[PDB]
Design a protein around this ligand. Sequence first.
Ligand SMILES: COCCOc1ccc(Nc2ncc(Cl)c(NC3CC3)n2)cc1
Length: 250
Amino acid sequence: RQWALEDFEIGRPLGKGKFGNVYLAREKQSKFILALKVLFKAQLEKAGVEHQLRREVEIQSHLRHPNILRLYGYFHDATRVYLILEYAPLGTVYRELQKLSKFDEQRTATYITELANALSYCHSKRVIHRDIKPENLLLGSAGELKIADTLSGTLDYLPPEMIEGRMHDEKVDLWSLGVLCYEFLVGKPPFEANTYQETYKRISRVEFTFPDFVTEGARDLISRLLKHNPSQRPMLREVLEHPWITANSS
Ligand SMILES: COCCOc1ccc(Nc2ncc(Cl)c(NC3CC3)n2)cc1
């Protein structure tokens, strides 16, 4: 079964995004509340992402999980493309991260625990994320996490394998998991530069430092999650189980 724009009431705008926007919405028959993404053809077919759209849509469509934002369906109108998403009633993780300095140890750890379950499961559907970052980590009405998937974007997030030219198997997500578990605890991603240029130089060689206020326990996890050669990085089992993790993961 498919859908149409008239089926929904286009309420208030949630985020003034990239390819268009995302709005609050409700299906009339069902009275079901959700988020709706209006993005134009004339937008994606004008950087080239025309195919790579309908691509990851289905990649997502068959997928279901509690720390993964569901897609409920999709469709197109006169001009544009529409994405019928889960609604995450507590906004972006970013929204929270800015409004606070950083996250307290307990909170960070639970956000990582959840991101494991969701990737550990996601690694068994033969799907990898590249750029999972907190512009798109959302919170459910119970306050817990929900992933919502030379010039490109900031790359504080992509591993050295994604920019040296090397191969990128399924242990990408461990890099990202470290980078984030850092950001959550420190305030900035650990490869912040004001030029793309150092950022590149600083990732390839793994160049970062920890403020005083970081437990040796965190530095321990982060350190062994941020390794140049993907080989030496743990399976996501070792992670969920890691000492510092399960000490304060609510
Ligand atoms: C003081 O600021 C008020 C907070 O405003 C909110 C913004 C966003 C949500 N949740 C939300 N749910 C689902 C999606 Cl798909 C989505 N998309 C995000 C925009 C990319 N955002 C809730 C509240």
